[PDB]
Design a binder for this molecule. Structure first.
Ligand code: TQD
Length: 186
């Protein structure tokens, strides 16, 4: 297991979802970015592991589940078995990671990516150790029901730039957004 990262798209009000749906219209380039990042292994012969909650898992069109090219790990305490189409199930992030430290996935996983939800984002942010926040900022308010927890700038530094991430404003569907990387280690 290489790096631990969280990837998220948040609106201006800090909204990540509305009724299991995204608060804004689909953004094809936001999607491509999310797929490239999570799928691209920094090491040949290895795969990235994407960790998500049950809600997140069920929020993706089936057509797209599991996220191909990556190991899908759903986090649940009520499921007794992995949803249809998923590869592993854990009760917690502490357990999903130990799983990685098993000879099972021992020698198969590069980087580990958390794709949601809040709860999952919140246990990653408590995980002591090195952590990178890959944030996509949508520059508008959008009716949301779930949120990204607030980032503590006293612990997370905003990087001036990152290889492979565009620094200027993007626009798709009259909607503006930018890419940001935050890094912690404490
Ligand atoms: C509605 O359509 C889709 C929705 C989803 N969702 C909701 C999960 C995503 C998509 C984008 C994204 C994710 C989560 C995130 N955590 N961080 C970044 N920044 N952005 C995933 C899909 O295909 C994989 C899909 O197919 C079109």
């Amino acid at each position: 297991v290489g790096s631990l990262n969280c990837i998220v798209a948040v609106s201006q009000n800090m909204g990540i979802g509305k009724n299991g749906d995204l608060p804004w219209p689909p953004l094809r380039n936001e999607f491509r970015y999310f797929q490239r990042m999570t799928t691209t292994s920094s090491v040949e012969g290895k795969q990235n592991l994407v960790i998500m909650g049950k809600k997140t898992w069920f929020s993706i069109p089936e057509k797209n589940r599991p996220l191909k090219g990556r190991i899908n790990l759903v986090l649940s305490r009520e499921l007794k078995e992995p949803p249809q189409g998923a590869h592993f199930l854990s009760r917690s992030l502490d357990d999903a990671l130990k799983l990685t430290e098993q000879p099972e996935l021992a020698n198969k996983v590069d980087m580990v990516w958390i794709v949601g939800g809040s709860s999952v984002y919140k246990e990653a942010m408590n995980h002591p150790g090195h952590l990178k926040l890959f944030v996509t900022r949508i520059m508008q308010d959008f009716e949301s029901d779930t949120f990204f927890p607030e980032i503590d700038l006293e612990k997370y530094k905003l990087l001036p730039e990152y290889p492979g991430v565009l620094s200027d404003v993007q626009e798709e569907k009259g909607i503006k957004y930018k890419f940001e990387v935050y890094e912690k280690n404490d």
